[PDB]
Amino acid sequence: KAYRGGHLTIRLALGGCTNRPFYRIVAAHNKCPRDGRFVEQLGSYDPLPNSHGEKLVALNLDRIRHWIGCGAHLSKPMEKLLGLAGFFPLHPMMITNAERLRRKRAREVLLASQKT
Amino acid sequence: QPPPKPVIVDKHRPVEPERRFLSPEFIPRRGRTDPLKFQIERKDMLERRKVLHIPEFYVGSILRVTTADPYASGKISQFLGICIQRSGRGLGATFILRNVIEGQGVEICFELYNPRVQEIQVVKLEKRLDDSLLYLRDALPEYSTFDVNMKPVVQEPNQKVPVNELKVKMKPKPWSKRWERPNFNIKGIRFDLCLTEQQMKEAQKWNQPWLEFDMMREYDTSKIEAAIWKEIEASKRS
Amino acid sequence: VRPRLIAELARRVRALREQLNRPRDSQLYAVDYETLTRPFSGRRLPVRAWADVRRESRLLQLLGRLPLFGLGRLVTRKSWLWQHDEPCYWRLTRVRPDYTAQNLDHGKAWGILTFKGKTESEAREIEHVMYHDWRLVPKHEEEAFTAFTASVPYPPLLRAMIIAERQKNGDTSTEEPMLNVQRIRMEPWDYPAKQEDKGRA
Amino acid sequence: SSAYVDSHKWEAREKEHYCLADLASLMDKTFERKLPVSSLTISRLIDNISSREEIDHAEYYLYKFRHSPNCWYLRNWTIHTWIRQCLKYDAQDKALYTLVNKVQYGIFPDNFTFNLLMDSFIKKENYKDALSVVFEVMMQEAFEVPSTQLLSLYVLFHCLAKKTDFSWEEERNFGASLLLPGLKQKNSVGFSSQLYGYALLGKVELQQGLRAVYHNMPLIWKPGYLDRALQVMEKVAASPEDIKLCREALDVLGAVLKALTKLVEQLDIEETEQSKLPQYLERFKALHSKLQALKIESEGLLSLTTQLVKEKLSTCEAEDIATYEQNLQQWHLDLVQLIQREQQQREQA
Ligand SMILES: [Mg+2]
Known part of the structure; x- marks a missing residue:
């Protein structure tokens, strides 16, 4: 299926049964379905913690750089994960969310100290 | 802002003024009778004309008519059609109209003096070289199929009668009237395709040239129509 | 293999028909100011431009009040000059109004532009002509306005x-x-x- | 200036002598087939017109040409053919109608043509027509011309002869028109008229906001018109001669009446003009006192000073006639080639 126009995009594909999501960063077209066919599987991600408590994620740096140099747009969630990793700049929306959470926590502590 | 208004003035002198035209139903028939009948029914239709306008037209002209019908949507009936013929004289003078709609060819015979009709309108005013257009039945439907809500084509107030020089294609030979004969003296149709040299050579057999050379059957009209104009002008003055 | 012709037939026929009788620029740019909806579309306008479309007029509506639609006359991008203190304008070179427009309030026109004094050596095309965010600068105070480092x-x-x-x-x-x-x-x-x-x- | 007004060359130069009815029918056919048409046809028609209903046909066909596929060309020589054809056959109502709804007709006379028009207005001795026309010229913003003296005389006489206390549209029109004629940096009259226009503009702003200042008027958005008037006064006092008139009293009256007891375009940091009124008035008193300490006759009526402008008026009318004959020569240059262009089509045919 040759999609008119469109553009390659490395994004998140969903797997696993219900109540057990497992994400897969994978190169695909913009018009591609969610779990539709892809071109190359790059890495994977478990949003759930392991027995150690940490969460799992894998990145294929060489192939990712290859696909970027070939040209491909990206998705905000996985780009946020990349910025968290450190191979990529940190996300401005991440900064704003962190600042909002910290302001809200300060407000909650203020309200607690006021009630007490 | 208000909109501008159109203005047009083209004044080539010996074109604009046209003078005369009489209605084809005022004149009587060759038959014998006292002109008292004629003048009384004429003044009747004239004091009716003082109300109703009968916008002047000709055969082949497109007329749109509105009439007060007892059983109709709004008790009114509106019909558009081309002029086939104007038949009869006096109050009983009528005109035939025809139109093709939904693939069906319908036609009406209108009394132009019955109070049942409300008013007349000329969507187009033209003249066909043929005096009678009864062959439009056998003609193709594409010639008769006309639009009902087409706007009135604007016509100059004082100009000559436009005569369209054309000819018409027709349905195949199995006709009802045998229009090909020379008795009708018609020219809108096209022999070259409607038939062959053999058929026209065989049909011109019934040709009788002496009809137009005869001079005792013709009906002079000069003094008659003069009196007609005189009395209609008298009725208009009074 | 069996070919098909009516496909290309209808394709080119529609091409010709739409390119012939496409809706006029003025016709589809017209707006009713009390409902804030473009005719022929039934779409509403953005809340940020509601007030500007209600109050301010269009580029050609501004240019219809002076000869030749003001070749070289100074119209500045209201959005650029509200987003930045620097002056920004359009070296309008070519103009063409729409004949079907009643007030001649629509058309196409463009030339060279400048952004914060960054003038370009290219008489390229304008963007967002139909918006109600157009501001004409007179022939006085004009050098003082366009003065930039x-x-x-x-x-x-x-x-x-x-x-x-x-x-x-x-x-x-x-x-x-x-x-x-x-x-x-x-x-x-x-x-x-x-x-x-x-x-x- | 009867010689400056009349001109037999324009009336007896390059007449076409074609049939008005023929040209009308041709234009009707062309605009019914809605194909573009050159201005040569309209020019020949206008040159051939010799009647009132013919000028009416010309107005209708000019509307059609405005709404025709071509509108930008705007040939000023054709415009002046029409202007002469209308003014010699005495349709001032229709002239004024076209000039006010120029957006509907798009007439745009140049310096000498408009000066001839306003001289005819002087000869007929009407004021309201000339007033509306000079407001439309303010809309045009074409004042760098020998007609600047005529415009100044008109505005400075009509503002005095007006005697109208309350009219916001008219007052904004006056305040905006009093600037452009004086921008040629002439003298006391010039920059003091600029001052009075600044005062009127600031008044209109303070009384109905800055919206109408720029919405339907070509003007600048700086709200500090009172500040600009103060700047003008202080720079004049610093610097020549300043022949003054009692319109400074009108300025005093406006300032005092404003000092007397929705979208917000004004910026938050900078305070609002309502809050700036006080220091405006203190600075205005201070500059009044500075001017009287420094010229201060305030008796010479400005309309009487415009007859001394007749000197430079009669000096510049010569160069205006020179520019007009140069324009006539350019028109005779390009139009003969445009006629050969029309013959090219028949040569091809
Ligand atoms: Mg039969």
């Missing part, structure tokens, strides 16, 4: 990658890696676009 480190993971690579290569290279940022001309959002590249209904 390193690098970043790599990410931590990437610089560590390069460190390991060059350490394997064998060189010390205590220098920290950097990139060009002065080369990268970060362009603001309001940089104009290509009217011909963007389509039309």
Whole structure:
């Protein structure tokens, strides 16, 4: 299926049964379905913690750089994960969310100290 | 802002003024009778004309008519059609109209003096070289199929009668009237395709040239129509 | 193989028909100011432009009040001059109004432009002509109005990658890696676009 | 200036002598087939017109040409053919109608043509028509011309002869028109009229906001018109001669009446003009006192000073006639080639 126009995009594909999501960063077209066919599987991600408590994620740096140099747009969630990793700049929306959470926590502590 | 208004003035002198035209139903028939009948029914239709306008037209002209019908949507009936013929004289003078709609060819015979009709309108005013257009039945439907809500084509107030020089294609030979004969003296149709040299050579057999050379059957009209104009002008003055 | 002709037939027929009787620019740009909806579309306008469409007029409506639609006359991008204190304008070169328009309040016109005194040597096309955000500057105060006057480190993971690579290569290279940022001309959002590249209904 | 007004060359130069009815029918056919048409047809028609209903046909066909596939060309020589054809056959109502709804007809006379028009207005001795016309010329913003003296005389006489206390549209029109004629940096009259226009503009702003200042008027958005008037006064006092008139009293009256007891375009940091009124008035008193300490006759009526402008008027009318005959020569240059262009089509045919 040759999609008119469109553009390659490395994004998140969903797997696993219900109540057990497992994400897969994978190169695909913009018009591609969610779990539709892809071109190359790059890495994977478990949003759930392991027995150690940490969460799992894998990145294929060489192939990712290859696909970027070939040209491909990206998705905000996985780009946020990349910025968290450190191979990529940190996300401005991440900064704003962190600042909002910290302001809200300060407000909650203020309200607690006021009630007490 | 208000909109501008159109203005047009083209004044080539010996074109604009046209003078005369009489209605084809005022004149009587060759038959014998006292002109008292004629003048009384004429003044009747004239004091009716003082109300109703009968916008002047000709055969082949497109007329749109509105009439007060007892059983109709709004008790009114509106019909558009081309002029086939104007038949009869006096109050009983009528005109035939025809139109093709939904693939069906319908036609009406209108009394132009019955109070049942409300008013007349000329969507187009033209003249066909043929005096009678009864062959439009056998003609193709594409010639008769006309639009009902087409706007009135604007016509100059004082100009000559436009005569369209054309000819018409027709349905195949199995006709009802045998229009090909020379008795009708018609020219809108096209022999070259409607038939062959053999058929026209065989049909011109019934040709009788002496009809137009005869001079005792013709009906002079000069003094008659003069009196007609005189009395209609008298009725208009009074 | 069986060909098919009616496909191309209808295709080219529609091409000709739509390109012939396409809706007029003025017709589809018309707006009813009390309902704030474009006719022929039934769509509503953005809340940020509601007030500007209610109050302010269009570019051709401004240019209809002076001869030749003011060749060289100063119209400035209201949005550019509200987003930046610097003056920004349009060296309008060519103009063509729409004949079907009643007030001649629509059309196409463009030329050279300038953004914060960054004049371009290209008589290219305007963007967003139909908006009600057009402001005409008179022939006075015009010179006074138009008067106008390193690098970043790599990410931590990437610089560590390069460190390991060059350490394997064998060189010390205590220098920290950097990139060009002065080369990268970060362009603001309001940089104009290509009217011909963007389509039309 | 009867010689400056009349001109027999324009009336007896390059007449076409074609049939008005023929040209009308031709234009009707062309605009019914809605194909573009050159201005040569309209020019020949206008040159051939010799009647009132013919000028009416010309107005209708000029509307059609405005709404025709071509509108930008705007040939000023054709415009002046029409202007002469209308003014010699005495349709001032229709002239004024076209000039006010120029957006509907798009007439744009140049310096000498408009000066001839306003001289005819002087000869007929009407004021309201000339007033509306000079407001439309303010809309045009074409004042760098020998007609600047005529415009100044008109505005400075009509503002005095007006005697109208309350009219916001008219007052904004006056305040905006009093600037452009004086921008040629002439003298006391010039920059003091600029001052009075600044005062009127600031008054209109303070009384109905800055919206109408720029919405339906070509003007600048700086709200500090009172500040600009103060700047003008202080720079004049610093610097020549300043022949003054009692319109400074009108300025005093406006300032005092404003000092007397929705979208917000004004910026938050900078205070609002309502709050700036006080220091405006203190600075205005201070500059009044400075001017009287420094010229201060305030008796010479400005309309009487415009007859001394007749000197430079009669000096510049010569160069105006020179420019007009140069324009006539350019028109005779390009139009003969445009006629050969029309013959090219028949040569091809
Ligand atoms: Mg039969």
